[PDB]
Amino acid sequence: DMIKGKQGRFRQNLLGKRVDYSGRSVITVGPYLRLHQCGLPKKMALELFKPFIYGKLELRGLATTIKAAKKMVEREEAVVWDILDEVIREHPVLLNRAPTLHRLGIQAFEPVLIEGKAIQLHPLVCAAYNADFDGDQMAVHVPLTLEAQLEARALMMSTNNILSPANGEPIIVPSQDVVLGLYYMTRDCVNAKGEGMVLTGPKEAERLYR
Amino acid sequence: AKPDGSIIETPITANFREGLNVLQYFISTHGARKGLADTALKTANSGYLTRRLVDVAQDLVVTEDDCGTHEGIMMTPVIEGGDVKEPLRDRVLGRVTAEDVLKPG
Amino acid sequence: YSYTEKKRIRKDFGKRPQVLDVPYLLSIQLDSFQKFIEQDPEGQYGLEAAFRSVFPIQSYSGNSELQYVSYRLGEPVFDVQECQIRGVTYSAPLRVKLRLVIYEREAPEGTVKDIKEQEVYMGEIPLMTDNGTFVINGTERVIVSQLHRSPGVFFDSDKGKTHSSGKVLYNARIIPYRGSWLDFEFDPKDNLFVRIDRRRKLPATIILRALNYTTEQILDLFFEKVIFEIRDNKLQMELVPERLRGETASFDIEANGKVYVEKGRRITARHIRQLEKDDVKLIEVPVEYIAGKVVAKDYIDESTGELICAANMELSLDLLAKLSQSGHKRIETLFTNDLDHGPYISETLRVDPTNDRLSALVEIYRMMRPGEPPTREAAESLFENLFFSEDRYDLSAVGRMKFNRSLLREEIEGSGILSKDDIIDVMKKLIDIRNGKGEVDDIDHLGNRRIRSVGEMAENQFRVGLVRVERAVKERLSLGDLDTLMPQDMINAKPISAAVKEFFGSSQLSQFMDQNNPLSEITHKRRISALGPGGLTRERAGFEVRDVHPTHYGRVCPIETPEGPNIGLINSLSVYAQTNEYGFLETPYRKVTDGVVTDEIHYLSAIEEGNYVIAQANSNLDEEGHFVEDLVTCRSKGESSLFSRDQVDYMDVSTQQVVSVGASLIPFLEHDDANRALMGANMQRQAVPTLRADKPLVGTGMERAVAVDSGVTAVAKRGGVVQYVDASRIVIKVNEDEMYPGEAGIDIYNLTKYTRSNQNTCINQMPCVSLGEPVERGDVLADGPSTDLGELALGQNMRVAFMPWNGYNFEDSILVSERVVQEDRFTTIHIQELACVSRDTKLGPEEITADIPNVGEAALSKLDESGIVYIGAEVTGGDILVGKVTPKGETQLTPEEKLLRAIFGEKASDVKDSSLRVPNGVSGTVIDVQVFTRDGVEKDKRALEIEEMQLKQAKKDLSEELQILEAGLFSRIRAVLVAGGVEAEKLDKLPRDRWLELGLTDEEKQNQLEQLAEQYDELKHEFEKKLEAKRRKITQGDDLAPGVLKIVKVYLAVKRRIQPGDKMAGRHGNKGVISKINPIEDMPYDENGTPVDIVLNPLGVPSRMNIGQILETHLGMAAKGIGDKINAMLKQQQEVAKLREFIQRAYDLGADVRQKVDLSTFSDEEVMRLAENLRKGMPIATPVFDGAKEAEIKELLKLGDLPTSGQIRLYDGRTGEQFERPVTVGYMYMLKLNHLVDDKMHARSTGSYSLVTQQPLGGKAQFGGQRFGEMEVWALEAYGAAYTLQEMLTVKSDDVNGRTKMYKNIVDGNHQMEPGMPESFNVLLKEIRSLGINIELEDE
DNA sequence: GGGTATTCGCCGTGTACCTCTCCTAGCCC
DNA sequence: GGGCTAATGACGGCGAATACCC
RNA sequence: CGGAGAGGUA
Incomplete structure (x- = not known):
């Protein structure tokens, strides 16, 4: 009976494989992040990359031991912000929805350190995640070795995963707000200020509308 | 639809911009409750179906x-x-x- | 009217006069517990019924019988409040008078001795707060009322017994109130089987054999005898026209000598009528039909008695000759064939292998009790136990009543046990159903399910306790002394106490008070759970019972239920719904006489509603209650219809009588999606009290009822004038007409101030009244949490604009102004409990001390001399609160530990640190310190100080009462002493108390002076003894577990502000998180330059159907516009006449609306205060399905001088250009749900480690990692993602050495991992190898 | 003929967490 | 004390174990 | 803390 418990070999499936270097938080929309970016709270980053931050701090000589690094990070000095920017310059992170019902349910992003306490998810990706913004909480993980990071960059990131792995075709389609904006702006009227004239490329179109 | 899943003789003749009578909202509640129960059961059963299909298909890799x-x-x-x-x-x-x-041709 | 009302009138738009006010919304709990605990002069629910059923108790021999006399409830040791603050239960002792009488042994009974144990103590039962709540361990616990099928007959359709076949079967289950279930089911072959409980079926007639019945008796009970006459060839039949329609034509029916109905056809009604008018009674029938008949009784020989025909076997020509020769002219057979009780019982008897009582009893005894070689005596005993025990097989009155109705008996009640008549009747009705003319009981019909509230369950648990004590006392009386002994020598409080305590502490219906919201409380106490001990299972589909039956109309709320795995199993009681005496629910309905709807109400039951026809609550009535409509919408069985105005039986009392209190508050409920309004109601409850209570400008009018009925509102018990107002106490000088004989003096309302609710949400009461303010009975003295001026105030009113502002509102995400954070609104206080208990250990009892080893002065500097942190100190996660130390009686340790403590410089002592530090992740300010110290432990300084504060409170209350008493006494002695000569002059210069030393003329006046002197002395003595009693109450030892010495509870207060991620949701089903705190000047602003507090995605409205929030926005815009106008006039200091006329106009707005206007209020001061409370808008009361029309809203917009479309053009404070079209701006009531972003963040890289399964788990100082479930592994698998699976399974999940070395590598400055030998693989390899199985490592 | 067509016991349980309880037991020294 | 110590108001599947028409 | 029982949320 110790050969097999539920759901099977204990250490390879349920239960329950909770893993470190991960976090979980409710999600907000950031409409300024680029498609390969996710907005991640500064405290979340600070506590997700403490070992990397310690390594950098002792690398710059700013700390002489792990105790000094602990004090240095907990004192929230302005120096650790540069350290965290360095360790997060391009270190990506993996966001997974609580139920993953298709391949895109987990995707990588480049984290941008933000104020707040929620994960600013790319607005155009949440449709692929089959998520919403109703208090539902996303989960972050950090692929923390080089080779996992590259596995994330080449494959996990939303840029390289834009078509549905179910029927092809983009899964990154504008869903509800940006589509409204475009439908409004591209509509036509039969009479309005600025009707009928000729303009030198869209140069003058932008100039005259603005 | 009504309980037993059949259509009511009298429709919900009211909009949402206009008001809903008490009985109309009562009748409409049946559909919402049915849909929510359906949603929960389908979530569970879809999880199970994903499990069985993954178990049957997982040992299949393009190799040539x-x-x-x-x-x-x-x-x-x-x-x-x-x-x-x-x-x-x-x-x-x-x-x-x-x-x-x-x-x- | 009401004084609290006249302070702030919430304008109503209801148009139908409200006959019958909203009843007390906790009536269910109060009714249940009063029925349970009151005295009963008869056998009725409660302790009286339990005792009368269990008692008297008789010895096996000795005539030593214990007789019940009376029960009295012991006065509780504590009131509700100090039960809360001491962590004990609110319990009243139970004392019962019992007389043990011993007669002569043995003679005609006459007592030899009688010993009367008066008020024997067999347990102290919990008592209810009068707010439908039970304090169990110092916490508010509620007995969630259960909805369970009523005892009685249960006619259902068996659809799973078909086993891949048609013709769904029938079943009839007898469910006793207690005892053994009974089951009569069919089979696909029309055979009737009996299952006692679930045990394997037997033929039904076996019970009849055990019930002393012969085959002939069984056949006589069910089948009607068919008479066959021995005359002429082929014999004759006494033709019966009532047997020609229950059978087919399988014989020649003749009339006047000619066969009118030939064999082969189907007999029609026309054929029967023509035969009857032909007047033929004896018909020539073929002998084959005679053979096909099955005889109903045995026939033997007339001389030798040899059996030739026996009951329930078919006839034959040989048997015909045998009966003819033995002597027979009449033959009585069965009336068989489908229709009219077909031969199902005959088939059962053919299946039944028994024909006599003993064999049937043997079989039943063996199948109830497997093996166990049967004894007919044991079988008889078991059968009597199962269906004729008067002490453990009960149907109760409700079961008997439902049973008789299911059998449609003319009886109304009867025996609580089962009888042969009951079983034969239920079989008859089941056979009738099988015949296709009976009814199948609806499984979910509320006329077939009943409410078991707290009282019934409590008395059932007390009955079980009485059963255990009864067994004990029955053993003792027979075993015990025949001489005098005391009746308390065999009564133990342990069984009853344990049963009752378990029920009220850990039953699946004793739930913690869902206490973060007065709505939350008042709907939790009205919760109706289909689950429970005797109810459904959490997993139940159940699709019909999850779904709403059409009999829930006005009994439970169809639209309020949790969205989890138990939707529909957990209902909430309607507003007007209540429980009948039996337990079934009823709804009030106005009686409609002939065309007049009387204000008289009848509480129609669930089944009563079925027979009657009920008009809709939206009928329009003029005159004295006549419909303006000759055709009116009605409901007869659950479906709508249009019926004549003179054919309706009853009317819904209110338009809102079909929603819960949670759903009733949602405004414009008639504009939301039912599902979306369901989310809205579920989010009503989850609102958390903000920093201030803010009325909703758009409401329903039930806010006052909910606020008052819930106990969070200090309601004035007795009317009077407020003698004293303070932040903690309210002192009412009661009106003398409501004063009691003697002097009850003042009424003191102590207010709960910053006490942790069960959801860690701060509850406190703000005194809304001021000095000298008159109050009458039933008005608010102090607003509770989430309550303003006696109005339920769940959330706060925000300025809202609906437009997708720069994509920061994507799905439902909500953008908030920085102004909201400025105003500190939506700011919430939260209270933690960090319970630090001192323990008694084998190495030394733990001590709470201020001197802690190996700590600095900073940690100690927040503590007093007693080791408990100062009240009011600002602490953060990690700081020491309670200086707990455990005497380290074990000084011997491993050399490694000693070397480590020597090298690291840590202190070495014979006591180890155990202090409770602030958990990492919480902070705040300490507001309460509670010390629980049971007798035998010294009272430290903090305990002494809290005792002194409590004594000061009690002393102040008693001293104010003493003040009023001695004021009256000294006034009357002054009146006496002034009379009887000139004595007032020195009386004025003498102190008030020094009038007892001044002389008086020796008369009756002097006698009265002396008498009042003794009165003053007696009142003084009453004062000191009351103070002493309070000191005993506050000083006595806590009810603490013996292993525990003291309890030190510290309360942490955090004031959480709204911020990105907070699921701050609307009332109508609106959802969303705080998107971003964009600055005040970036907010859109109107021409006036007024920014907008909230920007909502307009995408959520046209998809989720909840356009109700848009109507709320427009109406709130109008209301706040009226508020702006009135505020401008206040700043303009307009004439009081101007305010009066404008407010009268505002309230007069709308047609057929009854709200009534000034001047009936006070001319100036009341009008001034009303305007001052109205300067932040008109609170608008909108009945859910009887509310405001769009035209009325636009009228209010005109009166506010704001746009008629509710749309005004903003300017983007970012750019500063008006948007191309005007947008919708208004005021929306928004709720901050308890899902706070601080409660949802948790992230880690290291921290807690578990055993067995190495993975981060447990704790809240650093919570564990995320469950990387198999779905996530599968998502990685579908991608070419391989390695990340390896780290998330191997190197950062389980292997401790790998995690340590890999963390070391990262700290070294390089992201390093090497596959090598997977540790889990090596473990499993050794594990398989130990099985004598070698695993080869062959490479492909 | 023989395949349904019943009866006769065991057992499994979407996703994640928040709180709570409950965990081989018999027993001779 | 303690150190040893060998079912019914879930639901569905499923093999074993019976149940039955021609 | 290893796995079962219960409420709530999503």
Whole structure:
């Protein structure tokens, strides 16, 4: 009976494989992040990359031991912000929805350190995640070795995963707000200020509308 | 629909911009409750179905580029009755022919 | 009217006069517990019924019988409040008078001795707060009322017994109130089987054999005898026209000598009528039909008695000759064939292998009790136990009543046990159903399910306790002394106490008070759970019972239920719904006489509603209650219809009588999606009290009822004038007409101030009244949490604009102005409990001390001399609160530990640190310190100080009462002493108390002076003894577990502000998180330059159907516009006449609306205060399905001088250009749900480690990692993602050495991992190898 | 003939967490 | 004390174990 | 803390 418990070999499936270097938080929309970016709270980053931050701090000589690094990070000095920017310059992170019902349910992003306490998810990706913004909480993980990071960059990131792995075709389609904006702006009227004239490329179109 | 899943003789003749009578909202509540229970049960059963399908299909990996198998399947646009439900254009995309197609003439 | 009302009138738009006010919304709990605990002069629910059923108790021999006399409830040791603050239960002792009488042994009974144990103590039962709540361990616990099928007959359709076949079967289950279930089911072959409980079926007639019945008796009970006459060839039949329609034509029916109905056809009604008018009674029938008949009784020989025909076997020509020769002219057979009780019982008897009582009893005894070689005596005993025990097989009155109705008996009640008549009747009705003319009981019909509230369950648990004590006392009386002994020598409080305590502490219906919201409380106490001990299972589909039956109309709320795995199993009681005496629910309905709807109400039951026809609550009535409509919408069975105005039986009392209190508050409920309004109601409850209570400008009018009925509102018990107002106490000088004989003096309302609710949400009461303010009975003295001026105030009113502002509102995400954070609104206080208990250990009892080893002065500097942190100190996660130390009686340790403590410089002592530090992740300010110290432990300084504060409170209350008493006494002695000569002059210069030393003329006046002197002395003595009693109450030892010495509870207060991620949701089903705190000047602003507090995605409205929030926005815009106008006039200091006329106009707005206007209020001061409370908008009361029309809203917009479309053009404070079209701006009531972003963040890289399964788990100082479930592994698998699976499974999940070395590598400055030998693989390899199985490592 | 067509016991349980309880037991020294 | 110590108001599947028409 | 029982949320 110790050969097999539920759901099977204990250490390879349920239960329950909770893993470190991960976090979980409710999600907000950031409409300024680029498609390969996710907005991640500064405290979340600070506590997700403490070992990397310690390594950098002792690398710059700013700390002489792990105790000094602990004090240095907990004192929230302005120096650790540069350290965290360095360790997060391009270190990506993996966001997974609580139920993953298709391949895109987990995707990588480049984290941008933000104020707040929620994960600013790319607005155009949440449709692929089959998520919403109703208090539902996303989960972050950090692929923390080089080779996992590259596995994330080449494959996990939303840029390289834009078509549905179910029927092809983009899964990154504008869903509800940006589509409204475009439908409004591209509509036509039969009479309005600025009707009928000729303009030198869209140069003058932008100039005259603005 | 009503309890037992049959359509009511009198529809919900009221909008949301206009008001809803008490009995109308009562009747409408049946559908919402039915839908929510359906949602929960379908979530559970979909999880189970994903599990069984993954278990049956997981040991399958593309490992060779070409086996030279000129065998294949007839692959046609599905048409029911007079209406063409799906175009062969959609299906053919992303496949590899098992023979060299000719012109219809 | 009401004084609290006249302070702030919430304008109503209801148009139908409200006959019958909203009843007390906790009536269910109060009714249940009063029925349970009151005295009963008869056998009725409660302790009286339990005792009368269990008692008297008789010895096996000795005539030593214990007789019940009376029960009295012991006065509780504590009131509700100090039960809360001491962590004990609110319990009243139970004392019962019992007389043990011993007669002569043995003679005609006459007592030899009687010993009367008066008020024997067999347990102290919990008592209810009068707010439908039970304090169990110092916490508010509620007995969630259960909805369970009523005892009685249960006619259902068996659809799973078909086993891949049609013709769904029938079943009839007898469910006793207690005892053994009974089951009569069919089979696909029309055979009737009996299952006692679930045990394997037997033929039904076996019970009849055990019930002393012969085959002939069984056949006589069910089948009607068919008479066959021995005369002429082929014999004759006494033709019966009532047997020609229950059978087919399988014989020649003749009339006047000619066969009118030939064999082969189907007999029609026309054929029967023509035969009857032909007047033929004896018909020539073929002998084959005679053979096909099955005889109903045995027939033997007339001389030798040899059996030739026996009951329930078919006839034959040989048997015909045998009966003819033995002597027979009449033959009585069965009336068989489908229709009219077909031969199902005959088939059962053919299946039944028994024909006599003993064999049936043997079989039943063996199948109830497997093996166990049967004894007919044991079988008889078991059968009597199962269906004729008067002490453990009960149907109760409700079961008997439902049973008789299911059998449609003319009886109304009867025996609580089962009888042969009951079983034969239920079989008859089941056979009738099988015949296709009976009814199948609806499984979910509320006329077939009943409410078991707290009282019934409590008395059932007390009955079980009485059963255990009864067994004990029955053993003792027979075993015990025949001489005098005391009746308390065999009564133990342990069984009853344990049963009752378990029920009220850990039953699946004793739930913690869902206490973060007065709505939350008042709907939790009205919760109706289909689950429970005797109810459904959490997993139940159940699709019909999850779904709403059409009999829930006005009994439970169809639209309020949790969205989890138990939707529909957990209902909430309607507003007007209540429980009948039996337990079934009823709804009030106005009686409609002939065309007049009387204000008289009848509480129609669930089944009563079925027979009657009820008009809709939206009928329009003029005159004295006549419909303006000759055709009116009605409901007869659950479906709508249009019926004549003179054919309706009853009317819904209110338009809102079909929603819960949670759903009733949602405004414009008639504009939301039912599902979306369901989310809205579920989010009503989850609102958390903000920093201030803010009325909703758009409401329903039930806010006052909910606020008052819930106990969070200090309601004035007795009317009077407020003598004293303070932040903690309210002192009412009661009106003398409501004063009691003697002097009850003042009424003191102590207010709960910053006490942790069960959801860690701060509850406190703000005194809304001021000095000298008159109050009458039933008005608010102090607003509770989430309550303003006696109005339920769940959330706060925000300025809202609906437009997708720069994509920061994507799905439902909500953008908030920085102004909201400025105003500190939506700011919430939260209270933590960090319970630090001192323990008694084998190495030394733990001590709470201020001197802690190996800590600095900073940690000690926040503590007093007693080791408990100062009240009011600002602390953060990690700081020491309670200086707990455990005497380290074990000084011997491993050399490694000693070397480590020597090298690291840590202190070495014979006591180890155990202090409770602030958990990492919480902070705040300490507001309460509670010390629980049971007798035998010294009272430290903090305990002494809290005792002194409590004594000061009690002393102040008693001293104010003493003040009023001695004021009256000294006034009357002054009046006496002034009379009887000139004595007032020195009386004025003498102190008030020094009038007892001044002389008086020796008369009756002097006698009265002396008498009042003794009165003053007696009142003084009453004062000191009351103070002493309070000191005993506050000083006595806590009810603490013996292993525990003291309890030190510290309360942490955090004031959480709204911020990105907070699921701050609307009332109508609106959802969303705080998107971003964009600055005040970036907010859109109107021409006036007024920014907008909230920007909502307009995408959520046209998809989720909840356009109710848009109507709320427009109406709130109008209301706040009226508020702006009135505020401008206040700043303009307009004439009081101007305010009066404008407010009268505002309230007069709308047609057929009854709200009534000034001047009936006070001319100036009341009008001034009303305007001052109205300067932030008109609170608008909108009945859910009887509310405001769009035209009325636009009228209010005109009166506010704001746009008629509710749309005004903003300017983007970012750019500063008006948007191309005007947008919708208004005021929306928004709720901050308890899902706070601080409660949802948790992230880690290291921290807690578990055993067995090495993975981060447990704790809240650093919570564990995320469950990387198999779905996530599968998502990685579908991608070419391989390695990340390896790290998330191997190197950062389980392997401790790998995690340590890999963390070391990262700290070294390089992201390093090497596959090598997977540790889990090696473990499993050794594990398989130990099985004598070698695993080869062959490479492909 | 023989395949349904019943009866006769065991057992499994979407996703994640928040709180709570409950965990081989018999027993001779 | 303690150190040893060998079912019914879930639901569905499923093999074993019976149940039955021609 | 290893796995079962219960409420709530998503």
